Design a binder for this molecule. Structure first.
Ligand SMILES: CCC1=C(C)/C(=C/C2=NC(=C\c3[nH]c(/C=C4\NC(=O)[C@H](C)[C@H]4CC)c(C)c3CCC(=O)O)/C(CCC(=O)O)=C2C)NC1=O
Lengths: 162, 172, 162, 172, 162, 172, 162, 172, 172, 162, 172, 162
């Protein structure tokens, strides 16, 4: 899994080397940054339900056809609405993992790999998840570097969906 | 490979759960103990050549059969490969120390290693001895109170000792 | 050339990726560490001549046969002594580059690559340069993290000579 | 590839010289300006998809011949490759911004690129236009005063603009 | 370009062989089938405008949000409506090429390669084009083997969009 | 790989024999039934996406544990690979239908597949279920009386069902 | 084994594709051609003994040294004559397989692969088998497309022996 | 590579156009003339060995310098390579005949071939002669009225002659 | 691989010993017998084609089931591979004769060969028979008193016979 | 070209090595052997015409059909007889080259490479050339090690023709 | 690559000729002079390290700009590569001496070497100087009257000098 | 292991060939040379102890710091002196193996491979072993071709240490 620490090791191991300052500095930056990342991860976790709930409605608001069109891909039934909120929760939970891990690894591994295939196979619009993510970005209530951290991983997901 | 942080994330995902307050606290302590970990890695790495060579010398002094003709550590190619292995093990152990998890060591180094030595005729018990020597040296160097801001690194030394013991167990 | 910054880019470019926090954190650690590295680089530069001079004598002291045996590999002639001090200067100057660059790149590129071949071809003992380097380490007059930085690159050279 | 720091070291080594006080001072300023550089890279990277897609849309609106049948940007494969190139260029420009030197861009991206477009029949002047659009967007995003500690980033924006212009020059 | 004829040659040339009955039979099947394919290609060409026009409305009907949501990806403006009909024309025209060429080559080359990237980059739903294609399939007015031919290439496009 | 015709030739060669009148007759019937076989292959292939996706949806509805965190069909990579496998199996089954022999399926798809799933922790019984769903869908689509010259395809549907059952047996 | 059907599948499978009209057309050509191929295969089978017998004598006639020179490679002994007729039977039987299979596969697999090595090792002249094959071609009594089919595989063997 | 049909489609796409009635008619004639084309390909292919060997023999009889020591066709390796080239050219010409377009020949065979012969010292004019011999033989065999349903194949023979001349031009 | 001389050196090194007078004497005899060894190798090699082909013919005469349809030596590909194997074995045996040690044969030829034949369905006992035939022929040719300086080669013929028997044992 | 000397160099150069006794010994064996090889080469050259003439008749004798059957492959015409004798001369001349060069290189390069293709394309029996070569072997009039040398290269050709 | 003997054979074959008495005589002299050639090769090879290192030292003493910072022989990697090249050239020259022909040197070493140095910025004239130094040393060592059966090797030394001059010409 | 014989076989086997004169000549040169090599091997073996003893002192003489400096790498203790003489014995014994085997194989395999790593790791100067080897070369008491043989392998070791 891709983290600043595993990337530092991978770089050394690729060349059959022991680790050097060239690599310990990277890891130190990670350790220093963790204070801001952990604030963000905690706040997003603590406020996850209201973020998810808010995000779901933001989607339904922008794309009201998703609440009305017939189809298992849509949130026009209770089961569909439950799957949509689950998915949004997945996204948010992955953001929190990225923050805890200090890198994109968890999202890359658990969510991004396979994403386009899954979205195309199950007829899910990327634009739906982007709206959800834009809501979370807008309303997470973080400021300063904690917000920079959260937004970096949220925008990473948005970019993966574009 | 995983690191102390990804390890926790991976366990959490398997359950489909957000992190608990307890887990954040644990991981915050890890970050708070980070400087010590960087010193250890630096120190062991900065002395890698002497750790290996002194451990090799000590091994061959205690087990001269390894370097007598007909042995495994006899001939320069076999000697070179032996020293190399000691270097490799020390290397992966230092990765493990940085990561705060053994998955890199286990995965990329330790798995299949017993079977490999068994196929070659290399006595695993001897390798384990070399590992233990490197361990004692690595720890003395890493935990040396001279030239560093005083504090307690004991927990970390035990973790470090754990990676070395793990490696020695894998071959013995 | 291997620096925290070029290693961050190389990692991204290897995978056809744009740069992510996973990489910006590494570079930030580099930028933070630079304060200590630059102190060290400056002090070693300012005191280079006395360090070199001291280091040369430390060698001659430990290995007095180097000042007496006949041979162009030895420092038994004025030209030999000049080449020895030049070489020591090279080592020290490379340390300062490593500190400025924030990684092993300069030493790897300009000095370590080819080192064993050159030493064996010209009959130069690695143990000579190690002694020189141990002198510099002992007497650079740095304390705190500036000393940690200088010593990391000095020991790196020692390891390359072992 | 080189970075602002290795660039200086490389020049110094060629002369066989230690760094001067002036060079340390320069490089210390670079480090002092580092946060701004990280914000720029983050911001441009965080908006990479929209920068590209909005620049593509603007290009094809201004030059509809590119997407008319028989063109170069016509068919999905050719469209995909075009968008890809815009993504690639933006990518290498962001590397350059992080490094504070163009060698990665020049080397790994820009060299042979004119000749490549000339061989394919891709109009370089059009690519240059797309690059300039991305530039204007990238800079507006990077230099946006909202949501960031106020200060002056003007020097950096000019440097950034320089990488974009360099890339546009290389193909035009 | 992939046609029964180029696939026959490619198979022979891959093995450094001259062509054998094993390959001439394939090409004969192509020549025999061409009667049905050419009927289909002609009818679809002759009726292209009404098919395109009908197909466009079928989309707007099923997905009325496409005629109302603001965005250059939507057909909520005259220019958007023109681009949508152009695209549908592209699809239909490719079907006719596939029929003329006797294989998927033209569609593979001109339309399918890059398709997911283009759709995701410009925020176009595959489901839109599928509906258009289902309309064309339903209303092309072909029967017998001419319809089997047209539908094989239309469904091929549908599969490529899933 | 073999086809219904090469299969017969291969058996004949092993005996060193020319074909008997009975074998020619058999093979002539195969040729006489060829149109039906082409319709089946066309129809199943023409609906491959829906067959897979509807069978996947039905599987996960009946076995929600597969898509709960900690499962095998959980995460997009694992989901993607699962859908892929269903696509792959359907693909090889359609090859088999065209050839009128399973050797392509057996050889290129089915062999080592049980052991592969056992190594990964993928429940074979679940895969078998997905295969059976695809079977029922494939057959309904292939044997649909609408839009085709009427006749009896029953023998062929049973053969087709046979390839699907074979595949399901190979993993279950 | 190379048949129109296995070549169609191989082409699809090589690219990880399902089969398309591009491939079903080839197979249809095979199915249509089978009527002529099966006529030919049947007639050659029914008349195999007289063809073989005639072919053997045609060889002995053109190359009478084969009936007189001493050597196990020659047909100067009863055992040699039996081996020669067996071999000719092999050739004819392979032709019939090619016709039944609708391609060169059987002949390629069972007879052509290894052919030059076997002929050179056992001192058998290709020109002998060519004469046998020319006799079969001349005297098979097929007309129309049944003859085109038989001759395509007979000439294929002749080409393999040149 | 393209075939007569894909050639037309490719031209049409470049213009963004549907096929005209005139183009359908043209292509329908191609299909109507298909049997003749299959006979030609069959016949030339069925006699490939004799066409080559008789053309080689005729070449060396007319140009004995090629097989005198110190020549290009002297030694078995050089002879083998020469015969091979004649086989290769005939092969690509037959592909071209099947496809009804030269792109396979041009692309996969003819391009760089002059430069290749010029680099080796192989006289292109001699190769052209061999090609012309094969042409005359190929055409006599393909257009032989014996053993085939009578009709006129003249247009096709001229097309065929065209591929041979094209190949001869490419090296001469 | 080793040769009679390296074999001795390798044994000596394992003990850490210089050669004894006895070993020098042994090895001097080897050198003194060298001409005979070169004649054997030459003679067997110079007749390799007939040795193989005559042994093949004799095998198939004694075991006609091998060349009856459905056999292992039936079809030209299987025949070719069989003759090839006989050529290969003879080849490695001749290497062994030159070297005066079997390590090349054992290593590069004989190891895994039984398991290989068992996997294919090739009857090892039949291969052994072919080897023995080649042995009897090889020895008669190598030890033929005509056209060579008279002396006794008996020891060498027994050694040679030993390599053949070894090979036959390895498959039987 | 394969000679003891070029094989010695190739072995060294393959490993990036300078030449060692391991290689100079091989070359010395070559130099010592050259005395016998050069005797053989000279005698075969001096007696080439009578050997060729004798060899040609030996063939015609064993295979009299070669002097009577119609065909450009046969020696049934003056031109055919001239080509046959030329070819035999080629073989003999190659033997002499092998002896001069001290290895198989010349024969490998000028004659063996392409041999089976040429023989099969022009319908020439290997058995013809073997008989010619057996005549030369029988009647070269060399004894001792000069004969061992000549026969080694003659049998090498025979093996290449089997 | 060719050797003095194959060189003659190759010329003869081009003419289609048997060797003349004169050519046999020439080649017999070559064989008669063989011992001297083996001594030369042995001697130069046996002293390869000192020849190179002494020639390098002499070069850098005469051209100190090569080892001043910013030069081509400055840094250990560039030094290593330079020494390597001197080793490589000496190596190929010794091959040439053994073979009695330059084709190995020319082919495998000398061709493209000027262009290679020109692309790198390595001064060819300096390389030529190093080659000449090695030449003078190689010849003094090879032609040293001590410890060898007396005779005249003058012709051979001139040939040897020729290979060195050839190499120096190729880069200068 | 690299010997003239194994190199001859390796060359043949690399090309899937049987052995030819091109290779038997090499081996004959080996067999002829063995007389000189075996004289040398015997004399060096018989006189090994005095050679080793003499060689050890030659080193201590040229590099007297090796008998006085503290360090397990030096011969300043009885154990160090014992290891030094052992090593010299190793070198001499390898020379004798090279002579017996007729090539560099034993030395390459048992001693040269790993040599630089071992020397650098244990801080042993190549120049020490070179002096030892130069003593052995000077004082082995061989003349003629026996001396050429011994010196070829001794200088080979010297070259490997440079
Ligand atoms: C290019 C690929 C290709 C296809 C797809 C093809 C189909 C094809 N199927 C046909 C007939 C048919 N097709 C079917 C097939 C069916 N009816 C049923 O409900 C059966 C179970 C179902 C099979 C699923 C039947 C029963 C016939 C009429 C008899 C026959 O042709 O064998 C015919 C004869 C004309 C016609 O009947 O319409 C054609 C050309 N030919 C081709 O060359």
């Amino acid at each position: 899994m891709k983290t600043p620490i595993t990337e530092a090791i991978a770089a050394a191991d690729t060349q059959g080397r022991f680790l050097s300052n060239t690599e310990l500095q990277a890891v130190d930056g990670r350790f220093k940054r963790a204070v801001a990342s952990m604030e963000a991860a905690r706040a997003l976790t603590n406020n996850a339900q209201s973020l998810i709930d808010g995000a779901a409605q933001a989607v339904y608001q922008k794309f009201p056809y998703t609440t009305t069109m017939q189809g298992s891909q849509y949130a026009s039934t209770p089961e569909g609405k439950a799957k949509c909120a689950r998915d949004i929760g997945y996204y948010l939970r992955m953001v929190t993992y990225c923050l805890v891990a200090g890198g994109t690894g968890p999202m890359d591994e658990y969510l991004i790999a396979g994403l386009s295939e899954i979205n195309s196979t199950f007829d899910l619009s990327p634009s739906w998840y982007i709206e959800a993510l834009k809501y979370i970005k807008a309303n997470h209530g973080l400021t300063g570097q904690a917000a920079v951290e959260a937004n970096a991983y949220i925008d990473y997901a948005i970019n993966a969906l574009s | 490979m995983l690191d102390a942080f990804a390890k926790v994330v991976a366990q959490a995902d398997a359950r489909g759960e957000f992190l608990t307050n307890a887990q954040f606290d644990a991981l915050s302590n890890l970050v708070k103990e980070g400087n010590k970990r960087l010193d250890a890695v630096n120190r062991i790495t900065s002395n890698a050549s002497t750790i290996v060579a002194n451990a090799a010398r000590a091994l061959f002094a205690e087990q001269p059969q390894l370097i007598q003709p007909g042995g495994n550590a006899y001939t320069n190619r076999r000697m070179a490969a032996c020293l190399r292995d000691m270097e490799i093990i020390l290397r992966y152990v230092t990765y493990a120390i940085l990561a705060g998890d053994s998955s890199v060591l286990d995965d990329r180094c330790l798995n299949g290693l017993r079977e490999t030595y068994q196929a070659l005729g290399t006595p695993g018990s001897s390798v384990a001895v070399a590992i233990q020597k490197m361990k004692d040296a690595a720890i003395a160097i890493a935990n040396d109170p001279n030239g560093i801001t005083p504090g307690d690194c004991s927990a970390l030394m035990s973790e470090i000792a754990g990676y070395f013991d793990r490696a020695a167990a894998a071959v013995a």
